[PDB]
């Protein structure tokens, strides 16, 4: 059972299911671009001072530890926000895609059908796999069944 974005069909043939490849893929690509971007953040690492010796320079080493501790915290917060912003963009792209799927289910199958306002429609004609597959393929013509 593939697909992520797709269509349904009720009717007398029972229920039937088919997937919109492009809508599925673009949702995917959005997530993969974010993953790549988050995987390629460049942050400098922290090492010891080369000049500061143990026993001799304990006071400096305490400050060094302090600089590191505050830096880790800052970078953590900075990275956390990046993830929160990524999730924001991914979730928002969902609504763009869904709305675009409704406008496609409104361009096809003509005015002979009536919209439930549910993402779902009530059609005059029967559907089933083949007819639903053409809706998924974007090749469905209403005029098959002599309709507007």
């Amino acid at each position, epitope marked *: 059972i*593939a697909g992520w974005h797709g269509y349904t069909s009720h009717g007398a043939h029972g229920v039937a299911v088919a997937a919109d*490849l492009k809508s599925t*893929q673009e949702a*995917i*690509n959005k*997530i*993969t671009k974010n993953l790549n971007s988050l995987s390629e953040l460049e942050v400098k690492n922290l090492q010891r001072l080369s000049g500061a010796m143990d026993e001799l320079h304990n006071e400096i080493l305490e400050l060094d530890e302090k600089v590191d501790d505050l830096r880790a915290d800052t970078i953590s917060s900075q990275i956390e926000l990046a993830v929160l912003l990524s999730n924001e963009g991914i979730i928002n792209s969902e609504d763009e895609h869904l709305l675009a799927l409704e406008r496609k289910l409104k361009k096809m199958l003509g005015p002979s059908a009536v919209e439930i306002g549910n993402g779902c429609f009530e059609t005059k004609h029967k559907c089933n796999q083949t007819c639903l597959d053409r809706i998924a393929a974007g090749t469905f013509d209403a005029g098959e069944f002599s309709l507007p």
Partner: antibody
Amino acid sequence: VQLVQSGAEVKKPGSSVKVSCKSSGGTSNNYAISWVRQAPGQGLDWMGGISPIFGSTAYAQKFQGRVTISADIFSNTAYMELNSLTSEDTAVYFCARHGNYYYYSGMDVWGQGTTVTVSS
Amino acid sequence: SALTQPPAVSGTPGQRVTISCSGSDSNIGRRSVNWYQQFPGTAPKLLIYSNDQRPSVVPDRFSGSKSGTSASLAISGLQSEDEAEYYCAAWDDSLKGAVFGGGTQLTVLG
């Protein structure tokens, strides 16, 4: 993108092998990758495939139970592990990327090709 | 196997040659066909996808078609460099897996 399969392998019958693919110059994580083998003088044969962001792994019936296909999305790498090896498994292994997230599209890119020779 | 192609085809330089692929309802019938070209000792390349679509790198002398549970590749204006093995392929909804033809060797006389 360029996809580099792993080195050549020599295995004892019954052991297994692992074959890793690596794509260089971009990720392939948003696409399906299949594994395809070719016995000497013989044709292409699908083993199964994987689509790591989608979350799917699929297998050819003739290899079900004996092959394991996997991926590490963080290193942009895919793997194939084949168990219970037999002289019948001596052939060239091919990994390829598909045009989309699933196995329907025509695999447009492939590896240079892994060759694994079984014997004792 | 699953899809069946002739083991051999031949022609003379510049002629048109065709290679057929017979399947069933469970593969070619309900899914798209892809074609691949392979030279000896190298990996396969994609020649045709979605029944009738070429990659940008593929010459337009290559064309494909699909009818019923069958498919066909046609090569117009044969050249000497087209000598190679050819494989057809499709998803099969009964086996739930990808299938391939046995391969066809094309020989360029001359």
